[PDB]
Design a protein around this ligand. Structure first.
Ligand SMILES: C[C@@H]1CC(=O)Nc2ccc(O[C@H](C)c3ccccc3)cc2N1
Length: 114
């Protein structure tokens, strides 16, 4: 199957919107990590491929995904970066775990429909 950019966007955007809507949990994921502003200057020593919701949204908007799994891979990269960088007791780690639960739920019926 070949997927058109508008087909991917229509199917997948609602899944991204479901992540954005999560409060408190999405907040630290909504914008690219700024290590200096956040007071975590070691961040890029540890996280080599940063990813966040706004970047995923831009990629969906500008036709940078050819297949659904490429979108899923970016969402999971975002989660894996957070589970790697943060301690298991921290807000960002626990919030990541919540977003992974929401995403799994939202993406399954969408993939079945694609
Ligand atoms: C994803 C991004 C980078 C990361 O992995 N960890 C991280 C560390 C501290 C952060 O501080 C901000 C103020 C914050 C904002 C909302 C909830 C929790 C932390 C924010 C973050 N978030």
């Amino acid at each position: 199957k070949i997927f058109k950019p508008e087909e991917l966007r229509q199917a997948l955007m609602p899944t991204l919107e479901a992540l954005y809507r999560q409060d408190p949990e999405s907040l630290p994921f909504r914008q690219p990590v700024d290590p200096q502003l956040l007071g975590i200057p070691d961040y890029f020593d540890i996280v080599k491929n940063p990813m966040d919701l706004s970047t995923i949204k831009r990629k969906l908007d500008t036709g940078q995904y050819q297949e659904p799994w490429q979108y899923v891979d970016d969402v999971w990269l975002m989660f894996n970066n957070a589970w790697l960088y943060n301690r298991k007791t921290s807000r960002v780690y626990k919030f990541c775990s919540k977003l992974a639960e929401v995403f799994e739920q939202e993406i399954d019926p969408v993939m079945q429909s694609l």
